[PDB]
Amino acid sequence: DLELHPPSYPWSHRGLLSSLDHTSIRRGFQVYKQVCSSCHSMDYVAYRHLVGVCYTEDEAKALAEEVEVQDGPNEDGEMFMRPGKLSDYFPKPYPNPEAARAANNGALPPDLSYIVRARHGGEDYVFSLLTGYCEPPTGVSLREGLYFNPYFPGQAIGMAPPIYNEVLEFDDGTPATMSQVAKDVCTFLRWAAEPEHDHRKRMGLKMLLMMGLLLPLVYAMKRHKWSVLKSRKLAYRPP
Amino acid sequence: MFMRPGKLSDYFPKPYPNPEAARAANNGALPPDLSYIVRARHGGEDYVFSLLTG
Amino acid sequence: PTLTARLYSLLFRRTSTFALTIVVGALFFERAFDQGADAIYEHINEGKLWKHIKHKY
Amino acid sequence: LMKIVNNAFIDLPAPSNISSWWNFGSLLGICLILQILTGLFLAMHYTSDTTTAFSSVTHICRDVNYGWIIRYMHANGASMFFICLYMHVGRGLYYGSYTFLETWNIGVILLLTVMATAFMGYVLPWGQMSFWGATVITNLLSAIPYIGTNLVEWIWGGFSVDKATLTRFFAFHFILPFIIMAIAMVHLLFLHETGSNNPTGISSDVDKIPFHPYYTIKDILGALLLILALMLLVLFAPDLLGDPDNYTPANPLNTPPHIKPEWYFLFAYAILRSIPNKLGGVLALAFSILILALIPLLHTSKQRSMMFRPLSQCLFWALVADLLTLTWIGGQPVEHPYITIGQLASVLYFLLILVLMPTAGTIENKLLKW
Amino acid sequence: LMKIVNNAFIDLPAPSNISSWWNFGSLLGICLILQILTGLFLAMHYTSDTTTAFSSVTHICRDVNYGWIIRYMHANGASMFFICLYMHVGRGLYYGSYTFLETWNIGVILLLTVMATAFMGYVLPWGQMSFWGATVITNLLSAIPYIGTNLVEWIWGGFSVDKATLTRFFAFHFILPFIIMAIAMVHLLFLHETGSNNPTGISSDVDKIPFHPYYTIKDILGALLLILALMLLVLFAPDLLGDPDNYTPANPLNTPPHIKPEWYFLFAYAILRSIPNKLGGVLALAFSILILALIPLLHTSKQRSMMFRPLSQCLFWALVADLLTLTWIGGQPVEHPYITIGQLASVLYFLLILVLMPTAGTIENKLLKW
Amino acid sequence: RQFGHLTRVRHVITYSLSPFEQRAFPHYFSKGIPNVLRRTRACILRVAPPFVAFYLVYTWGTQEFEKSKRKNPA
Amino acid sequence: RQFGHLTRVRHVITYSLSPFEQRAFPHYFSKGIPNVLRRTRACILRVAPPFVAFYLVYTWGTQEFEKSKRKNPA
Amino acid sequence: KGFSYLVTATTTVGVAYAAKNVVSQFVSSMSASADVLAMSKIEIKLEGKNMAFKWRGKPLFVIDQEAAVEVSQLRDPQHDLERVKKPEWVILIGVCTHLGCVPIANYCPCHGSHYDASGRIRKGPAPLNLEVPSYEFTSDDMVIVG
Numbered sequence A: 001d002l003e004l005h006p007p008s009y010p011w012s013h014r015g016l017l018s019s020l021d022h023t024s025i026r027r028g029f030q031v032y033k034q035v036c037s038s039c040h041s042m043d044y045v046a047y048r049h050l051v052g053v054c055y056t057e058d059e060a061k062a063l064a065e066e067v068e069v070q071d072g073p074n075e076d077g078e079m080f081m082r083p084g085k086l087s088d089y090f091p092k093p094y095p096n097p098e099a100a101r102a103a104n105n106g107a108l109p110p111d112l113s114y115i116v117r118a119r120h121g122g123e124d125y126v127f128s129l130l131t132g133y134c135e136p137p138t139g140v141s142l143r144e145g146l147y148f149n150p151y152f153p154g155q156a157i158g159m160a161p162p163i164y165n166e167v168l169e170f171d172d173g174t175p176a177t178m179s180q181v182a183k184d185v186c187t188f189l190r191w192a193a194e195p196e197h198d199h200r201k202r203m204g205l206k207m208l209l210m211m212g213l214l215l216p217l218v219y220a221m222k223r224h225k226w227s228v229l230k231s232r233k234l235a236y237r238p239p
Numbered sequence B: 001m002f003m004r005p006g007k008l009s010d011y012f013p014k015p016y017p018n019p020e021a022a023r024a025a026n027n028g029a030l031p032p033d034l035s036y037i038v039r040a041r042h043g044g045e046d047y048v049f050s051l052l053t054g
Numbered sequence C: 001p002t003l004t005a006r007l008y009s010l011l012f013r014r015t016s017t018f019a020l021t022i023v024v025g026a027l028f029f030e031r032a033f034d035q036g037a038d039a040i041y042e043h044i045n046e047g048k049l050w051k052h053i054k055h056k057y
Numbered sequence D, E: 001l002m003k004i005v006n007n008a009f010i011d012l013p014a015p016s017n018i019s020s021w022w023n024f025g026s027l028l029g030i031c032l033i034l035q036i037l038t039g040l041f042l043a044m045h046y047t048s049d050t051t052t053a054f055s056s057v058t059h060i061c062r063d064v065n066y067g068w069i070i071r072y073m074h075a076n077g078a079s080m081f082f083i084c085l086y087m088h089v090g091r092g093l094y095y096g097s098y099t100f101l102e103t104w105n106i107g108v109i110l111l112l113t114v115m116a117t118a119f120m121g122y123v124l125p126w127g128q129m130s131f132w133g134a135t136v137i138t139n140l141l142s143a144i145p146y147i148g149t150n151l152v153e154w155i156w157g158g159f160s161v162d163k164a165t166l167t168r169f170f171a172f173h174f175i176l177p178f179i180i181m182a183i184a185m186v187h188l189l190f191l192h193e194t195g196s197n198n199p200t201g202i203s204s205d206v207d208k209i210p211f212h213p214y215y216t217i218k219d220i221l222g223a224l225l226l227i228l229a230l231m232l233l234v235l236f237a238p239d240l241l242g243d244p245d246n247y248t249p250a251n252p253l254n255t256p257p258h259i260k261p262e263w264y265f266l267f268a269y270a271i272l273r274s275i276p277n278k279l280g281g282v283l284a285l286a287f288s289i290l291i292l293a294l295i296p297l298l299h300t301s302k303q304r305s306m307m308f309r310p311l312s313q314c315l316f317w318a319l320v321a322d323l324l325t326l327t328w329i330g331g332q333p334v335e336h337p338y339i340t341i342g343q344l345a346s347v348l349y350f351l352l353i354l355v356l357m358p359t360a361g362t363i364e365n366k367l368l369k370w
Numbered sequence F, G: 001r002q003f004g005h006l007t008r009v010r011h012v013i014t015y016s017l018s019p020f021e022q023r024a025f026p027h028y029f030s031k032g033i034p035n036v037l038r039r040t041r042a043c044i045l046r047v048a049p050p051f052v053a054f055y056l057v058y059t060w061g062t063q064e065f066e067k068s069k070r071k072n073p074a
Numbered sequence H: 001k002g003f004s005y006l007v008t009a010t011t012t013v014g015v016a017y018a019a020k021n022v023v024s025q026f027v028s029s030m031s032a033s034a035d036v037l038a039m040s041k042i043e044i045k046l047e048g049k050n051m052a053f054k055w056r057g058k059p060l061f062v063i064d065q066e067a068a069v070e071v072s073q074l075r076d077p078q079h080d081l082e083r084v085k086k087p088e089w090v091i092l093i094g095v096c097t098h099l100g101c102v103p104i105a106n107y108c109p110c111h112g113s114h115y116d117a118s119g120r121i122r123k124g125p126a127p128l129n130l131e132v133p134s135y136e137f138t139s140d141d142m143v144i145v146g
């Protein structure tokens, strides 16, 4: 019946000059691949956007060579599959929404490209969503496939629990606990809906140290001219 | 996806899904569409008539 | 004379010079202000940016 | 030689007692140019088709070299636009400028031009509020008898919003600011026959002064604070005003729970939402705006300003509250605690204008014997 | 009260000895409005994306209620535009109006605005000549050293024409006629300080007359013949001028045998085509237009007109031939019989302007002793 | 600028009539058509000959173009 | 309209100084801040109380909204 | 007069900085996006056929008797193996040198400029042999044209 407001968690990027821990973006991408990318059709991104952020050219290009992509009209007049390249977007899980509803209990995974900015609270929601699965309360009954989580509206979701402790293992070898996963993924998703965060703050910073420096000087140049008339005495000297 | 009988709102059933298969189903050459071929070819009708009958 | 008065009669008097001065200072100013913020931004976000994780990969 | 027209903008006589309020009257010249300038480069990549539009936005926000900025300098810039208006419009009320009857009426047609423009500007990217925000506002004209279903179908190019109704706006929308750019010049022309209108209300002809050194730099100073308070939004909080839903693709088979158009309608949207009747609330809406044309026939005090009318001051800023209320009350859903406020506040809006602001001068004339 | 400016258009003094030539000077006010009016409704359905554009044209030509007209009132209307120009521009030469130095230079910048507009207007629908017509004209700027490859790539949004380069025009193209709509008002303002310039060349101040009854209806009569000679094209021969290929979809892997842009460049395209060198022909092109700015420094006769200069008449209409030649010679392919003509005719163009038209007045001054 | 200070006139008289008191098209055929000819004879000589020569270079330009495509005896 | 025929003035004297001969911001802190207060006391009474009441209807409007969602004892 | 005007300059200093950047921000929008560049350098290609494939929105046209032709006789003196790296893999940008058209393999149609199997000119309004791009062979079954 009620909503639920997530709290105001800290982050490595909540500050007005705090960028993203790009390391935290790295392991988060592993999570999207091992787990999410079986059902989450992220379409508005490609591996080439990962360069200069979390991976390199070769390491990312390795991942396009990994998965096959539908591309090309053959001279025979057919289409085939090839290893992906950088310019190809993420391999979509399913060709359309309906098959995703049929491959679930009628429900549709929303994309994760802009979900963070498209959901009130964004990260705090999404983090506290995954980490808010709990046994139902008294008096509540729920159909098959559905589950309980308060943060989602209606408190009834068709979300199979996707995360569990050591569902996978990362490269550098950090503790793959349910939380540390949830950070690096939520750190990732913000980057998806903001490939400009690093540069947003740079011009985010360069602005002030111009305007804070200019704005007085102008405010002097204003007062430099007006001072003729900020300082003016009049009179009335008839006969 | 499936097949149904056409209705009025559907355009003409396209012969081939793409140009290439039309080139492969011919000697490498491609039939041009006939929608605007008349106005897209000098003379139009007289050409096209005298093409078949030439 | 102060620096100010020495500065006036050299540059800020002749308008042809006064415009020549500004692009000069701006041309060098672009070279400092960027280095400043890029380092402060680097400094405040130490251990987060790509160039800080550019050697591992 | 035509430069001599810029006697209007160089050697113009204008007062000396002038606040920083009137900078707001000038910033729109910057916002109007700044928005078009941005929006133009912006629209080198937009696409007026459904299947590609939302992608054609993200084509900018991701791949373009600094294209991501231009969406937000434009969008939030469109909001700093209004923030100047609803200080610029409330001005002449509080300083008595509406007396320039030839000018105030122009001050309407600019507004209605925008409030039908900015609407078109929200719907282009198909943000799942675009569509329904297009539906809710546009459907109201169906309330009319014997033509409502015909016009709305006519503007829906059919029977509801679709690919055609997008493209009918992107051309109606990429054009009107020029019509504003022109009519704005008219809005200044009728002024130039009389000049400005001081806070006091007095003809300060004895104390008019130039414009090139003094109000120019002041306007720049005014402009400088604008860019500042526009860079902050784009750089530090672009998600602030624009509802988050506008990043979701649009689907007619799924509504959000809560719907609201962008924040700035809400003083007016709420007025309609108060009335449970359909039509009889609409004509309050259009009258909620066109009432500004009805004011100059309600200037009672043989004074002009409100600097010298402390009673009307108590009623003026009161109106600002009711707006700041109706700005928010519409922004929240339809439930019993708030509906009781809209039935009051919306009536207060019409009430303060059409009863009491005249009544003050009717009194204040009498406290001072005329 | 601002109506009093239409002293310019109501109570204006103007001559009485006036031909129907000067109607052409007025029709552009109609063509400019008529084109935008059409093109606006037209662009309610156009799409700035490749895959749908050519369909989005046929979306009009077939399915829209009387949408098929608007393509052709617009397109051929854009050609009746020029037909007025190249009678309107040749005028002041033959009647000596270029002496209004403040005005003639404006008469250039309108033209170059259009000849970079109309170009953008041909490429929107991807007619297989759009693309290559975009390629041939745009590639020439690559001839420049050290920036050619950079600009053309910069305007190609990359490395050749593609989806982006379409959309970079549809916004550059849907805007400029307003810039023409404004600059046109400037083009009249400098005039209003001096008024028109009779066929004789004499200050007819003694015989200036009103404008509301007389030249108004005459302009309408002028306008009526325009619509007539515009309805004929659209109704009876829309395929006439526009090359037939423009209905073919565009494909970079198949060129037509013969290429030409639309007919009206051809006086200028041919000039480039004559020169086998790349760059040195370009600067003839831009000079083939900007030479009009160079004329007023070559007014030799202490008379003005050419009504009273029978020798220059023999050279003026001669220039019209060379244009009517170069209009056609460019329209035909590159082969030996014609190339020998372009090497001559293009030189004749520069030659008649810069040598002989001065030389006439240098003589005609002397035949009559001044 | 407007009527009132343009220039000077002295001792000139104007006679002008209503339109209602006169036919619109008097002597349209009678006096006009001789005036069309006199109008025409005074322009024709220095208007055509370029366009005349054009008809010949539109003539020879195509004929000489047609031949070049026809084979030679070889 | 411009300077020269606006209106009449008689027997008034103006004393004005260059900017260069004076500081830009004299007594910015000294005389201004008392003038800010006097400026403030003359507006505060007839500016706030609506906005004060707004803080209460933004207050009671949410509290009374929160309760209505909480269940009743039934 | 020095101190006050010094403010005016240092103002104008910062104006140019903010202006020099912001202007180039837009101008980089008119430039090529990021998507186009990823399709710029890469072209992963793979005997007796006229292989012409689109690339950079331009064509990609891809030895016993070819070497027989005299280079001194050619309008542009240039040998085959100067143009190519492998003998049996011809590469060139399919741009008729005259006025930018699409030649046909087994030939500039708009002006009838005869070309070899290698793309060198034999009869031309075409002045030069056709442009060859810079490229690279990773392996004998793939190419990196760029």
Ligand code: HEC
Residues within 6 Å of the ligand: A031, A035, A036, A038, A039, A040, A104, A107, A108, A109, A110, A112, A115, A119, A126, A129, A130, A152, A157, A158, A159, A160, A162, A163, A185
């Ligand atoms: C079993 C396939 C699958 C797995 C694996 C998976 N997802 Fe989901 N996801 C779904 C489906 C199905 C929904 C539908 C939820 C709904 O309808 O409310 C969903 C919903 C979501 C949502 C939408 C939240 C909302 O408000 O509806 C987010 C965010 C999300 N998943 C993130 C994740 C993350 C993070 C992971 C890995 C920890 C993950 N998904 C793994 C299928 C999956």
Ligand code: HEC
Residues within 6 Å of the ligand: B026, B029, B030, B031, B032, B037, B041, B048, B052
């Ligand atoms: C065998 C399948 C087939 C048949 C049946 C067929 N077409 Fe063609 N059409 C083609 C192909 C293949 C071409 C390619 C011609 C070319 O490449 O020049 C073509 C070319 C054309 C053209 C193009 C003319 C041009 O200038 O290239 C026209 C027009 C045309 N056909 C009309 C017709 C008409 C009329 C008929 C029935 C009388 C017809 N087609 C039946 C396959 C076919």
Ligand code: HEM
Residues within 6 Å of the ligand: D035, D036, D037, D038, D039, D040, D041, D042, D043, D046, D057, D071, D074, D075, D076, D078, D114, D117, D118, D119, D120, D121, D122, D124, D125, D173, D174, D177, D242, D246
């Ligand atoms: C007063 C004038 C205008 C107003 C009030 C207005 C309103 C808006 C608004 C509020 C948005 C927000 C979309 C978003 O944030 O995602 C927008 C986007 C857009 N504006 Fe407008 N606009 C105006 C003029 C223009 C102009 C002048 C142009 C072009 C020169 C333009 C082109 C666009 C386009 C193509 C979009 C889609 C981009 C997007 O949705 O982000 N608009 N407009």
Ligand code: HEM
Residues within 6 Å of the ligand: D021, D022, D023, D024, D025, D026, D028, D029, D032, D085, D088, D089, D092, D097, D098, D100, D103, D104, D106, D107, D108, D110, D111, D180, D184, D187, D191, D195, D196, D197, D198
């Ligand atoms: C794009 C929109 C607009 C532009 C460009 C614009 C421009 C201006 C400018 C430059 C001024 C002179 C500055 C000043 O007097 O404070 C002015 C004054 C004025 N404007 Fe606006 N304005 C716009 C919208 C409006 C609107 C919506 C109204 C609504 C009533 C309005 C009403 C007025 C009035 C009454 C004045 C009187 C000036 C005075 O009292 O001295 N204007 N306008």
Ligand code: HEM
Residues within 6 Å of the ligand: E035, E036, E037, E038, E039, E040, E041, E042, E043, E046, E057, E071, E074, E075, E076, E078, E081, E114, E117, E118, E119, E120, E121, E122, E124, E125, E173, E174, E177, E242, E246
């Ligand atoms: C002097 C101004 C302009 C010129 C010279 C010009 C030129 C052209 C030309 C030659 C075409 C031919 C396309 C065809 O026939 O198929 C065309 C089409 C088009 N015009 Fe423009 N145009 C002008 C202004 C405009 C304006 C003002 C608009 C909108 C208000 C516009 C929008 C379009 C569109 C969308 C098309 C595509 C339709 C088509 O290709 O048929 N143009 N334009």
Ligand code: HEM
Residues within 6 Å of the ligand: E021, E022, E023, E024, E025, E026, E028, E029, E032, E085, E088, E089, E092, E097, E098, E100, E103, E104, E106, E107, E108, E110, E111, E180, E184, E187, E191, E195, E196, E197, E198
């Ligand atoms: C949209 C484009 C244009 C518009 C709307 C326009 C409008 C006009 C009008 C209404 C007149 C007065 C009628 C007349 O004097 O015959 C005029 C005159 C004139 N125009 Fe155009 N014009 C345009 C383009 C040009 C161009 C391309 C030139 C090129 C030189 C030009 C040069 C002149 C000149 C020299 C006059 C002198 C008037 C006189 O001699 O009495 N104009 N223009």
Ligand SMILES: Cc1nc(CO)c(-c2ccc(Oc3cccc(OC(F)(F)F)c3)cc2)c(O)c1Cl
Residues within 6 Å of the ligand: D008, D009, D012, D014, D022, D023, D025, D026, D028, D029, D030, D032, D033, D181, D182, D184, D185, D188, D191, D192, D196, D215, D219
């Ligand atoms: C008193 C007073 N008066 C005037 C004009 O009389 C102005 C004033 C001065 C200059 C103006 O010129 C501009 C500048 C930018 C955009 C603009 O719009 C547009 F789009 F050009 F029509 C007008 C517009 C208004 C002013 O700023 C003040 Cl404070």
Ligand SMILES: Cc1nc(CO)c(-c2ccc(Oc3cccc(OC(F)(F)F)c3)cc2)c(O)c1Cl
Residues within 6 Å of the ligand: E008, E009, E012, E014, E022, E023, E025, E026, E028, E029, E030, E032, E033, E181, E184, E185, E188, E191, E192, E196, E215, E219
């Ligand atoms: C001698 C002479 N003079 C003038 C103006 O001085 C005009 C003349 C009269 C009216 C004009 O007004 C118009 C009418 C329609 C469109 C137009 O374009 C626009 F509005 F600028 F885009 C201008 C423009 C020019 C004229 O037709 C003749 Cl013949």
